[PDB]
Amino acid sequence: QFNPYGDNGGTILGIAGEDFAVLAGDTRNITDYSINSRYEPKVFDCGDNIVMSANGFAADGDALVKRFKNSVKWYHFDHNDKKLSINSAARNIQHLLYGKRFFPYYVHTII
Amino acid sequence: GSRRYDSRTTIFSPEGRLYQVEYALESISHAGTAIGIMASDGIVLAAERKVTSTLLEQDTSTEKLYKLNDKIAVAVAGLTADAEILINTARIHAQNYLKTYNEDIPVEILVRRLSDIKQGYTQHGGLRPFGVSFIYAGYDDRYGYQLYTSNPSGNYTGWKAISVGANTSAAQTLLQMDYKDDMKVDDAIELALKTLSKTTDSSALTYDRLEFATIRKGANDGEVYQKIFKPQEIKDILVKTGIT
Amino acid sequence: MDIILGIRVQDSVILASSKAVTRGISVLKDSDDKTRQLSPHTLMSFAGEAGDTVQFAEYIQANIQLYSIREDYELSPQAVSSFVRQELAKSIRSRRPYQVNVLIGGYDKKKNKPELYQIDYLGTKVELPYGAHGYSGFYTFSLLDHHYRPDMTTEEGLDLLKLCVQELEKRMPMDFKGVIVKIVDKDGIRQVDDF
Amino acid sequence: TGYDLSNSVFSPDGRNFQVEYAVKAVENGTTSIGIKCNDGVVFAVEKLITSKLLVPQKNVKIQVVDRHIGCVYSGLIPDGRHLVNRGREEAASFKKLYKTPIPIPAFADRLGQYVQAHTLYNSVRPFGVSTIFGGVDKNGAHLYMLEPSGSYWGYKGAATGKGRQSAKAELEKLVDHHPEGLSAREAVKQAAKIIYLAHEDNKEKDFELEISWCSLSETNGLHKFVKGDLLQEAIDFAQKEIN
Amino acid sequence: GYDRALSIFSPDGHIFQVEYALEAVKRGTCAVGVKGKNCVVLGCERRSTLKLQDTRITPSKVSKIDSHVVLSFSGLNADSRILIEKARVEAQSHRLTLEDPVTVEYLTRYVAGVQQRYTQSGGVRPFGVSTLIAGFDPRDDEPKLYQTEPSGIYSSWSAQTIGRNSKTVREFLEKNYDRKEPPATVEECVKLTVRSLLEVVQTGAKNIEITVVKPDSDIVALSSEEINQYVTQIEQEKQE
Amino acid sequence: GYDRHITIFSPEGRLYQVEYAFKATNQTNINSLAVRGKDCTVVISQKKVPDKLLDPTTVSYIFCISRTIGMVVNGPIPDARNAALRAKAEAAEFRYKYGYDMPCDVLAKRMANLSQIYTQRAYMRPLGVILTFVSVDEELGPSIYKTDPAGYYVGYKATATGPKQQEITTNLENHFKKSKIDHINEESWEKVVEFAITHMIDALGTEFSKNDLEVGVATKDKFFTLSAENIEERLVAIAEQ
Amino acid sequence: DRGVSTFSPEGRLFQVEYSLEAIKLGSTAIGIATKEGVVLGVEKRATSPLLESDSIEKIVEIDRHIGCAMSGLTADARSMIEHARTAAVTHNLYYDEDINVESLTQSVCDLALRFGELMSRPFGVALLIAGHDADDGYQLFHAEPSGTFYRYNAKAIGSGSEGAQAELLNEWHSSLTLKEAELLVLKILKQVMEEKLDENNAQLSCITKQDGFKIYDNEKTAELIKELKEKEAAE
Amino acid sequence: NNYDGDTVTFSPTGRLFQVEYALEAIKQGSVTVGLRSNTHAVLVALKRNADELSSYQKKIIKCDEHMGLSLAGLAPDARVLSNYLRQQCNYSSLVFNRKLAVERAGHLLCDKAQKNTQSYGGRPYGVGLLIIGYDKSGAHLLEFQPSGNVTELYGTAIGARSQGAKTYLERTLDTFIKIDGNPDELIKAGVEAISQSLRDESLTVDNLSIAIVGKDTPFTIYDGEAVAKYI
Amino acid sequence: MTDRYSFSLTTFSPSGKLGQIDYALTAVKQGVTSLGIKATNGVVIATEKKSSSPLAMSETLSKVSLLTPDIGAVYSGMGPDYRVLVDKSRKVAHTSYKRIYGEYPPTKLLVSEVAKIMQEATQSGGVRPFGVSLLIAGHDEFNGFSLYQVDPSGSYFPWKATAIGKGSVAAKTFLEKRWNDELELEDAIHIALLTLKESVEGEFNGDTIELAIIGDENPDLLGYTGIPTDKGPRFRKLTSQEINDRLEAL
């Protein structure tokens, strides 16, 4: 039977300071015991000083980042180029994720 | 597009009348007269057939009087084809109620739903209304014997005695004159026939130009019977009251 | 698990229903009324799948109340039971069926007679002198077969019912936290507060 | 009367006046032509230079369907584009099911049936274009012209627009003077001449020439635009003949 | 589906189908609502060109929507059944989801919304009906009387009338109804309602219907003799 | 008078749109003819190519519907091709559903029923065409069945259609009065084609070259159209007698 | 007849232009924007004295930071308000923030042209939408059935609009206090109203950053009416 | 006359009057100008107010980072068409990782406008658009008309008195086309162009709207004190 | 391309007439005469075969049609409208009766279904009424022999004998003089041929007349044997030769 999920490995880490924040992630991409790539980035600048990563199943991770980047673009179009605050981005990402509640994105997301 | 050819069947006139409903009522006023009379121990339905030929098969014919269930019948005035569409709907509606509640449908409930269907054709859908007026005669254990009428507007009202179709104005005056509340079925039979005999556009009222029916509790022990009269039985009842 | 009983006597129908609501290893509530008044002289008790029970009961209640307002008339207990049966008989071949069993106790004002109907989730209707749903019947039916008479008073019916609850409290595995008892007669529906 | 107010209504003659009114919109448009040759077809069109501000070479009017069919039209330009978009869908589904690229007669009937369908109902307007089209298939070269009614035939030469009569007369001379056939490179030059001659019926604004061709030998059976040296050579041939 | 825009604007900014629906209301039998200190009374005309009627079974002019709210109307009778049915269904639906009966304002707002929807929907004509909706909110003793009309506007009234010759009975109520002091009792309120109908009704034996609504679902319809006593009493005081 | 624009009855019980569709039939100014032999059914039609720029091989009003059925149309080409594509589809579907080749008369009935719908339903106009179907049916033998915009259809011993149809009709009537039989008593289809052209020449009073005619022939298990040279061969045979 | 979405020869939609005539028949509504807030005021216009005027609801809350006044066929506004409220709340659910006043207005105006042969005709009501957000501050918008909206410093709509607008042209400046704006709406309403202005036949409201959208009591408006009459007599 | 009831009806001379009436709404609209060099493309638009108390109706809309338009006519129709363009540009990016060619943008608008001119019930769009962009073949300017006709140009203008600017640009063609690598000068030429369409009114700070896209410039709009430089 | 005619094309006029039904009846009046006569042991239906051309084969055009083995139909008015009604009538006899009850419908109920179809063409969106009147003759076990007329409105009436179309007024009068309740089937065929000669002008033989009966069961016409309960159709179309035999003793 066809299994729609996979595990591409890797790990990510986010820390917040007083006037800054970091989002780190390793660049290795794997399936089972093989290396697919030694440099495949999974931490992205999404605009409006928001960085994002969706780690787990890479297809679902890329899809989610792609949809959120697009969500930022349309937020500008619909609300007079207003800056998307981090709290508003977070709430928007919840709805992206929960919209697939019964066929989930297998990712741990950090912004 | 097709806007050009639309009659707009469901609009108001400047005076606040529904054109198509008014014109359907005008159609109905040329149809054969049908009379309903409610007595204390039963109901009479009497109706005049609309032009006969000597070669029309009279015994195997049904034009005016239709059975809806064992306890309810209707007299028709208007387009027969339109009436049969509505009758089959009413027959189904009665059986739905029986299936749901295990009780025969109350007369008013059946009348209201048939009248609601007619109303719909005057408010939406762009179709012509049904060119039909009904007299409903029936019995249930809440109100006993009941007469109603409905018309193309989908408005219905209850009656002690009523006429539809041709010469209703003259017929209603005659019923209003000779009707009284303590009346029996056999007296009502006589009133129904006498009224048609005076309001008819024919030369003389005969058995072959009539349909007749009674709803009595004539069967024993509170059980209600519908009698759709045969040709020979109409011939006999016409002799018995001295019209022929 | 959920106990619903019914007894039809000379002049009334008596419904007894258990007060416990249990989820897992916790009794969440001990005062639950497993009943809805459908009309002034018709009462429905219910038991079955969580959520489904109350959702179905209230849906039937709304429909009977809608009928009452429309016709300015109360449906007979026989008519209400047939409506309820048909709704369950539809439900059983749906995508997700209502898993609810009901008893309908009513007083027919036209006949001046009490009436008790037992209807399961499949839509299996029977009129009975006494009825029960679930495991309760395995004790109460034989007990009532012995002690029931058709001409009993409401007081005799309540004592007969006390006998059933005592037997269930002795031999049933689960604590059902007693019963709420309600009487349906010519004067309508009332609750016995001290049982 | 009122027979001309609604599409699909027959007049007492047996005519659909709305289609005849769409033909008037075609007659108002610029001139376009088609020339069938030895192993292919050539298409040309007049582009009126309304202003200095129009970018030369950059408002392309001839359109390709699949890889082997070319289409040009006169009249309402948007209506022509709608027809080509449909033609592309029809050619794509034919290739999907049957593998082989759509034959030209097959393609002609696909457009024909679609245009004819817009004369069957009062809820649609007929097409305001006559379309000249064709290409090369397994059976050789085919040229077609399709009209607002849905009517189409095969042609040796075809013309439509404001200068159709001038162009038709010039086309009839080529058919008479070349019974054996015309070559592809010759037909490109002749197409330029005929557009320049047909421009006499639209001579207020000066114009820009646009040519395309399909030929079994010259373009390998595919639709290509004529550009650069071959275009300027064809323009010069046409300029020499008007003087 | 039949799509035609039947209700549309005209050059002067009127929607004629909505305005012609108001003419149907003007043709209908007169209906009046008067609210007292502790009650609302709904009075209704019944035309007397119809003798040989059966009043047991004939549709009554005032309809119960729930046990605490009533609806009367003027205009097309068949149209009114559709509004009453929808209102009755919404009444039960509100009880089911909010666990509380409708307020009179809410039930009115719903009925008015239905009427408005039929003025900008394709394929439909407006309702040829105006309604008076009266009752008491749950656990409240303040009387409520609202009016709706075909356009979809609704509002609250101390007293109001609709139907044929309503302008005559509105004139009467405008001078005979004091806002400081509404009718203190049912008796005073019913009498003022009967008086106002007596300006137009032509008599009032079988022509007048009265329905009294009091707080906590207390609705009763008066009989002929009960109404006839008000008619008899008013005429004797008039001869002065 | 909107009763003349759509297919509803006029006060005298007429459908004017149907009547005006009949007038569209003659818009091409072409006459057709059909006759039956012992073994075959021949249909002939005039071919007028006015424009010199036209490719004459693409100008045709005869259509091969199925292997066994042929159809000639009298009326404008867009409506003709509309009818032809539908008939081809219907004949193909019949074979798939019912396991045998659609008979000529059944296809005629089906196309006539479709035409009837356009006379009753308002949104669809009638097609301004008359369709003549020809075959050698495996049960009924040589067959001619003809459909019009009213949705009428019938079988024929022989038939003709077009502006000068009545002249051709009476010419054929007079022949069958004389011969006393239902068909052309001839063995080969070649001589039945010669009969068809000869009697068209006599009725119309015109001579024909090879490019002025169009011929379709139905035999057992195939319907085919003739080339210009097949017709020329046929014209030579008439001239030498 | 003719299509509902037909253009006139001058390049205007018949039905939209005819709905604008319906709005001219409607009761007056005025809005004034300041740096201390936005004031919204309306003429109630009871058709009869028996009608309980406090049930006339022509000023309406959309969210805490956005209010709305109407003029024309006011029944048509119910579904527009319903849409506005849903749009405002939905945006708060999706983005955990208040929705910009301009974005709300644009959402309401998207409904406007969704008519034809969608609803059967345009809306017969104009809206004044007033609000505050952090980006553009205090704002007033005029939303028409054409689907167009303009921001305004001040605006009047309804039967007295052209006279009231000319008065607003003179009186408005960029330094108006909230109290000054309140009196100015009352003054201009009293000028264009048929009946004599009081607390029962006119209604005031405002939106401020601090307290949000508030409809004023009849007691509060009555004092502002009294303060206005005294100030006009005082020179 | 009898043939202007809907878009589905041709006149006896082959005209579509509903489409021509839609065209008339553009002529009543406020003037807007478009022009380009080889490196940049510029839109200039005169904005219109209701009165002195109102805002000035925004004429310019951004479609992508590399594309956008100016409008003249029904503004809600420009919103529908710009939103369609935003989606088509977006589809091209998400699916093909490809910036939508300005020529394809034109073709898509043509076909969307056309469908509204051949079916019963619908109406034509009542707005004209000037689309500018920078793509893989350099700078572009397009003119959209709601008949469906789209046209690529060096420069143009639409709206009331657009003929003044259109004549000016026709004279200035050889100058402004070679303003390469100089944004401010290409805007100055566009501002001088729109000045040939002014009557009784002059260009103020809250009246003028300028947009620019080019080689190393995303599509950006200038309003308010950012256009004071050019008056 | 969509159907925009969702509204009625038959509406009431101020006088109460339904125009399109009246005009449909006018079309029926123009149509060729057809008749039906009911005997004690059968029913006969008959009509003239109006040939459009002498080159046309009038055998291929059937005006009298079998609906069920015991029910037949004939018409006056528009032929194409009749043809599609026969298709729909044959199908509805199966879908709404035979596929449910395993037997063919009685005459009155099949008639009722045809009437319904014709009524819907009088009220539904975007359609004109059918331009035909039908005469339907048939037999069934519990009602015996019967004859019905169906009009464009959807109304139907049972008849002892009647005629419709061109010369119906004269033909009805002729049938009144000759009809009695003791007529045998052969006597009814004789009267049918006499009545039809009055309205026919040209040739009067078995090739220009179409005539069918509803009578005794025909086991020979069944096509199989073995089941005693299967009987064979009561409907039979008289041959060209069978008509000419009766025209000699006329």
Short mmCIF file of N, CA and C in Angstrom, two decimals, chain E residues 122-193:
data_model
loop_
_atom_site.label_atom_id
_atom_site.label_comp_id
_atom_site.label_asym_id
_atom_site.label_seq_id
_atom_site.Cartn_x
_atom_site.Cartn_y
_atom_site.Cartn_z
N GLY E 122 -33.47 36.85 -7.38
CA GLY E 122 -33.95 36.56 -8.73
C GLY E 122 -35.07 35.54 -8.70
N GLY E 123 -36.05 35.73 -9.58
CA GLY E 123 -37.13 34.77 -9.79
C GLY E 123 -38.32 34.84 -8.84
N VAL E 124 -38.27 35.73 -7.85
CA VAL E 124 -39.31 35.82 -6.82
C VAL E 124 -39.93 37.22 -6.79
N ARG E 125 -41.20 37.29 -6.41
CA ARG E 125 -41.85 38.57 -6.12
C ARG E 125 -41.90 38.80 -4.61
N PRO E 126 -41.96 40.08 -4.18
CA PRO E 126 -42.08 40.37 -2.75
C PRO E 126 -43.36 39.83 -2.12
N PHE E 127 -43.34 39.66 -0.80
CA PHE E 127 -44.52 39.24 -0.06
C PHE E 127 -45.52 40.39 -0.05
N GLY E 128 -46.76 40.10 -0.42
CA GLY E 128 -47.84 41.09 -0.38
C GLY E 128 -48.49 41.10 0.99
N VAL E 129 -47.67 41.33 2.02
CA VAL E 129 -48.07 41.18 3.43
C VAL E 129 -47.31 42.17 4.31
N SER E 130 -48.02 42.81 5.23
CA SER E 130 -47.43 43.50 6.38
C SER E 130 -47.92 42.79 7.63
N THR E 131 -47.04 42.67 8.63
CA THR E 131 -47.37 41.95 9.86
C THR E 131 -47.32 42.86 11.08
N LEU E 132 -48.15 42.54 12.07
CA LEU E 132 -48.02 43.05 13.42
C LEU E 132 -47.61 41.86 14.29
N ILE E 133 -46.47 41.98 14.97
CA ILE E 133 -45.94 40.91 15.82
C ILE E 133 -45.90 41.42 17.25
N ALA E 134 -46.61 40.73 18.14
CA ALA E 134 -46.77 41.15 19.53
C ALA E 134 -46.51 40.01 20.50
N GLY E 135 -46.02 40.36 21.69
CA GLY E 135 -45.76 39.38 22.74
C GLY E 135 -44.91 39.92 23.87
N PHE E 136 -44.39 39.01 24.69
CA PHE E 136 -43.53 39.34 25.82
C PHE E 136 -42.27 38.51 25.79
N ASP E 137 -41.11 39.15 25.96
CA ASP E 137 -39.83 38.44 26.04
C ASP E 137 -39.84 37.46 27.23
N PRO E 138 -39.04 36.37 27.16
CA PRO E 138 -38.96 35.45 28.29
C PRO E 138 -38.55 36.13 29.60
N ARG E 139 -39.31 35.85 30.66
CA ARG E 139 -39.09 36.41 32.01
C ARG E 139 -39.12 37.95 32.04
N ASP E 140 -39.99 38.53 31.22
CA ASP E 140 -40.13 39.99 31.10
C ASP E 140 -41.62 40.36 31.04
N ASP E 141 -41.97 41.46 31.69
CA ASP E 141 -43.37 41.94 31.77
C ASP E 141 -43.64 43.22 30.96
N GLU E 142 -42.64 43.71 30.22
CA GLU E 142 -42.79 44.88 29.35
C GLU E 142 -43.43 44.45 28.02
N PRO E 143 -44.59 45.05 27.65
CA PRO E 143 -45.24 44.67 26.39
C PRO E 143 -44.46 45.09 25.14
N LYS E 144 -44.53 44.26 24.09
CA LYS E 144 -43.80 44.49 22.84
C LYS E 144 -44.76 44.39 21.65
N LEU E 145 -44.72 45.39 20.78
CA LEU E 145 -45.49 45.41 19.54
C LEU E 145 -44.59 45.92 18.43
N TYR E 146 -44.45 45.12 17.37
CA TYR E 146 -43.63 45.46 16.21
C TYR E 146 -44.44 45.34 14.93
N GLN E 147 -44.03 46.11 13.92
CA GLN E 147 -44.65 46.06 12.59
C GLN E 147 -43.57 45.77 11.55
N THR E 148 -43.89 44.93 10.57
CA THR E 148 -43.04 44.71 9.39
C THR E 148 -43.83 45.03 8.12
N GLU E 149 -43.11 45.19 7.01
CA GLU E 149 -43.72 45.48 5.71
C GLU E 149 -42.88 44.86 4.56
N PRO E 150 -43.46 44.75 3.33
CA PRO E 150 -42.81 44.05 2.20
C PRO E 150 -41.36 44.42 1.89
N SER E 151 -41.01 45.69 2.07
CA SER E 151 -39.64 46.17 1.82
C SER E 151 -38.61 45.49 2.71
N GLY E 152 -39.01 45.20 3.95
CA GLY E 152 -38.14 44.58 4.94
C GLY E 152 -37.84 45.46 6.15
N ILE E 153 -38.31 46.71 6.14
CA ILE E 153 -38.16 47.58 7.32
C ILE E 153 -39.10 47.12 8.43
N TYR E 154 -38.63 47.26 9.67
CA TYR E 154 -39.44 46.96 10.84
C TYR E 154 -39.17 47.98 11.94
N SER E 155 -40.14 48.14 12.82
CA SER E 155 -40.03 49.10 13.92
C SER E 155 -41.04 48.80 15.02
N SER E 156 -40.81 49.40 16.19
CA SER E 156 -41.64 49.21 17.37
C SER E 156 -42.70 50.31 17.46
N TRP E 157 -43.90 49.94 17.91
CA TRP E 157 -45.04 50.86 17.97
C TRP E 157 -45.76 50.75 19.31
N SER E 158 -46.16 51.90 19.87
CA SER E 158 -47.03 51.93 21.04
C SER E 158 -48.43 51.46 20.65
N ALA E 159 -48.87 51.91 19.48
CA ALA E 159 -50.05 51.35 18.82
C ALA E 159 -49.93 51.56 17.32
N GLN E 160 -50.45 50.61 16.55
CA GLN E 160 -50.37 50.68 15.10
C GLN E 160 -51.48 49.88 14.45
N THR E 161 -51.80 50.27 13.22
CA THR E 161 -52.79 49.59 12.40
C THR E 161 -52.24 49.43 10.98
N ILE E 162 -52.74 48.41 10.29
CA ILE E 162 -52.39 48.16 8.88
C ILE E 162 -53.63 47.65 8.15
N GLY E 163 -53.61 47.73 6.82
CA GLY E 163 -54.71 47.26 5.99
C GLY E 163 -55.59 48.37 5.45
N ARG E 164 -56.76 48.00 4.93
CA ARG E 164 -57.69 48.96 4.32
C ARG E 164 -58.28 49.91 5.36
N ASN E 165 -58.34 51.19 4.99
CA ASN E 165 -58.76 52.28 5.88
C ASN E 165 -57.94 52.36 7.18
N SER E 166 -56.68 51.94 7.12
CA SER E 166 -55.79 51.99 8.28
C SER E 166 -55.44 53.44 8.65
N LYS E 167 -55.42 54.31 7.64
CA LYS E 167 -55.14 55.74 7.85
C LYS E 167 -56.22 56.42 8.72
N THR E 168 -57.47 55.97 8.58
CA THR E 168 -58.59 56.42 9.43
C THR E 168 -58.43 55.97 10.89
N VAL E 169 -58.09 54.69 11.09
CA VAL E 169 -57.91 54.13 12.45
C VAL E 169 -56.59 54.61 13.09
N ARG E 170 -55.56 54.87 12.28
CA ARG E 170 -54.32 55.48 12.80
C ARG E 170 -54.58 56.91 13.30
N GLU E 171 -55.40 57.66 12.56
CA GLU E 171 -55.85 59.00 12.98
C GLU E 171 -56.50 58.96 14.36
N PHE E 172 -57.42 58.00 14.54
CA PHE E 172 -58.13 57.79 15.81
C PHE E 172 -57.16 57.52 16.96
N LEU E 173 -56.28 56.54 16.76
CA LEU E 173 -55.28 56.14 17.77
C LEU E 173 -54.28 57.25 18.11
N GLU E 174 -53.92 58.07 17.13
CA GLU E 174 -52.97 59.18 17.34
C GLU E 174 -53.47 60.24 18.34
N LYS E 175 -54.78 60.49 18.38
CA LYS E 175 -55.37 61.42 19.36
C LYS E 175 -55.89 60.73 20.64
N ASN E 176 -56.27 59.45 20.54
CA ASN E 176 -56.83 58.70 21.69
C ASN E 176 -55.82 57.88 22.52
N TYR E 177 -54.57 57.77 22.06
CA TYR E 177 -53.53 57.04 22.80
C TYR E 177 -52.55 58.02 23.44
N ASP E 178 -52.50 58.01 24.77
CA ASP E 178 -51.56 58.83 25.53
C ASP E 178 -50.31 58.01 25.86
N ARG E 179 -49.14 58.51 25.47
CA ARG E 179 -47.86 57.84 25.76
C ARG E 179 -47.50 57.82 27.25
N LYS E 180 -47.94 58.84 28.01
CA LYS E 180 -47.62 58.92 29.44
C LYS E 180 -48.38 57.81 30.16
N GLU E 181 -49.65 57.63 29.76
CA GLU E 181 -50.56 56.70 30.40
C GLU E 181 -51.16 55.76 29.34
N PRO E 182 -50.54 54.58 29.13
CA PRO E 182 -51.17 53.57 28.29
C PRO E 182 -52.33 52.92 29.04
N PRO E 183 -53.25 52.24 28.32
CA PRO E 183 -54.36 51.57 29.01
C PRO E 183 -53.87 50.70 30.18
N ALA E 184 -54.26 51.08 31.40
CA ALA E 184 -53.75 50.46 32.63
C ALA E 184 -54.11 48.98 32.78
N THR E 185 -55.24 48.57 32.21
CA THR E 185 -55.72 47.18 32.30
C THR E 185 -56.05 46.60 30.92
N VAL E 186 -56.35 45.30 30.92
CA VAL E 186 -56.79 44.57 29.72
C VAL E 186 -58.09 45.19 29.19
N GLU E 187 -59.04 45.41 30.11
CA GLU E 187 -60.36 46.00 29.80
C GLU E 187 -60.26 47.31 29.02
N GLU E 188 -59.44 48.23 29.52
CA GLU E 188 -59.19 49.52 28.87
C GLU E 188 -58.54 49.35 27.49
N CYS E 189 -57.59 48.41 27.41
CA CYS E 189 -56.84 48.14 26.18
C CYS E 189 -57.71 47.50 25.10
N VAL E 190 -58.50 46.50 25.47
CA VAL E 190 -59.43 45.84 24.54
C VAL E 190 -60.47 46.84 24.02
N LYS E 191 -61.00 47.67 24.92
CA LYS E 191 -62.02 48.66 24.56
C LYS E 191 -61.51 49.69 23.55
N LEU E 192 -60.29 50.19 23.78
CA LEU E 192 -59.65 51.13 22.85
C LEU E 192 -59.40 50.51 21.47
N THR E 193 -59.03 49.22 21.46
CA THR E 193 -58.86 48.46 20.23
C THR E 193 -60.18 48.27 19.48
#
